[PDB]
Design goal:
Structural class: mainly alpha
Family: Belongs to the cyclic nucleotide phosphodiesterase family.
Subcellular location: Cytoplasm, Cytosol
Largest sheet: none
PDB class: hydrolase/hydrolase inhibitor
CATH class: Mainly Alpha
Protein name: cAMP and cAMP-inhibited cGMP 3',5'-cyclic phosphodiesterase 10A
Number of helices: 15
Order of helices and strands: HHHHHHHHHHHHHHH
Strand content: under 5%
Bound molecules: 4-chloro-1,3-benzothiazol-2-amine, nickel (II) ion
Subunit structure: Homodimer.
Radius of gyration: 20 Å
């Protein structure tokens, strides 16, 4: 089912104003929402306003939406409200450096998609649900969770006075849902591998063209992935801390696989922490680097995200060689 924010919750956010000093920081790729928990909702409003305009959605309908989107996230270590807003910010940063490539309808859809992309997450992966045949795996055969995430989004839209997209033409309403659906589905990392490879080939052969709708969906696809993984693009100490959350969640799933007579993969096994560095190294070379490498080629203003990822790759190599500092 679906939860609704209180009258007290959405009204408090409307009064919200972003401290002056933050306006300058929020624009940067490396900005870290972490030290500002109370502000997160109003941080998103700010990004929506700056990107899509103040007269984009009715403020009340938007604020009701956001605080209900907050409440429908779970107290899991990683795939939580904190993550949703961190992905939204990275998208906002990309959009601001690439504003005129994307239409007004796309930007609003992509920002909403990022905030909604992990809705009602349980801390269990696609592997888990399909290995053990959860009812979600039978209803959604591929990209299982990502389909539930979008289904959750639509359910929140259908709440009393929550529909932010109502003041669009019925044709544009169809379009923005499809943009959102295609964005949320693209966060399934299984799909990423094929997407990047294809996008790379289209760029090298020069056939890439943003006026071709199928190309746009793919670039949007890579952008979604870039935002999903942006923890690997923050400053090393922030990157290190977030990893602890990702693994805290991985390990609790491993704790379930054991009882049902399965040795879970090394990455999810809490008695196998020693492999974590080399696992990150592998994940950067196989997924992260190539994702930010390709995105930069397509959108050169996004280059700082790749610089920061190369930076964190280097720090994981340092941890492997035993050169690790304290960092808490
Ligand atoms: N830093 C991050 N690491 C991972 C791994 Cl190892 C698997 C899947 C997603 C992510 S995000
Ligand atoms: Ni997800
Ligand atoms: Ni995510």
């Amino acid at each position: 089912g679906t939860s609704i924010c209180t009258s007290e919750e959405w009204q408090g956010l409307m009064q919200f104003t972003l401290p002056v000093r933050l306006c300058k920081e929020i624009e940067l790729f490396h900005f870290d929402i972490g030290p500002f928990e109370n502000m997160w909702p109003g941080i998103f409003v700010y990004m929506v306003h700056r990107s899509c305009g103040t007269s984009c959605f009715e403020l009340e309908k938007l604020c009701r939406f956001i605080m209900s989107v907050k409440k429908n996230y779970r107290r899991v270590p990683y795939h939580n409200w904190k993550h949703a807003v961190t992905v939204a910010h990275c998208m906002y940063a990309i959009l601001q450096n690439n504003h005129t490539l994307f239409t007004d309808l796309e930007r609003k859809g992509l920002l909403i998609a990022c905030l909604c992309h992990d809705l009602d997450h349980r801390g269990f992966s696609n592997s888990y649900l399909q290995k053990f045949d959860h009812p979600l795996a039978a209803l959604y055969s591929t990209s299982t969770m990502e389909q539930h995430h979008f289904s959750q989004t639509v359910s929140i839209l259908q709440l009393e006075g929550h529909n932010i997209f109502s003041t669009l033409s019925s044709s544009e309403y169809e379009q923005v849902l499809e943009i959102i659906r295609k964005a949320i589905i693209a966060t399934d990392l299984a799909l990423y591998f094929g997407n990047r490879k294809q996008l790379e080939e289209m760029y090298q052969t020069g056939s890439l063209n943003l006026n071709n709708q199928s190309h746009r969906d793919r670039v949007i696809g890579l952008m979604m992935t870039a935002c999903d993984l942006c923890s690997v693009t923050k400053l090393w100490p922030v990157t290190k801390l977030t990893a602890n959350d990702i693994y805290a969640e991985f390990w609790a799933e491993g704790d379930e696989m054991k009882k049902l007579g399965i040795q879970p993969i090394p990455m999810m096994d809490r008695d196998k922490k020693d492999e974590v560095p080399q696992g990150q190294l592998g994940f950067y070379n196989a997924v992260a680097i190539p994702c930010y490498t390709t995105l930069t080629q397509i959108l050169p203003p996004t280059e700082p995200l790749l610089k920061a990822c190369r930076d964190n790759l280097s720090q994981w190599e340092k941890v492997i060689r035993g050169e690790e500092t304290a960092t808490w």
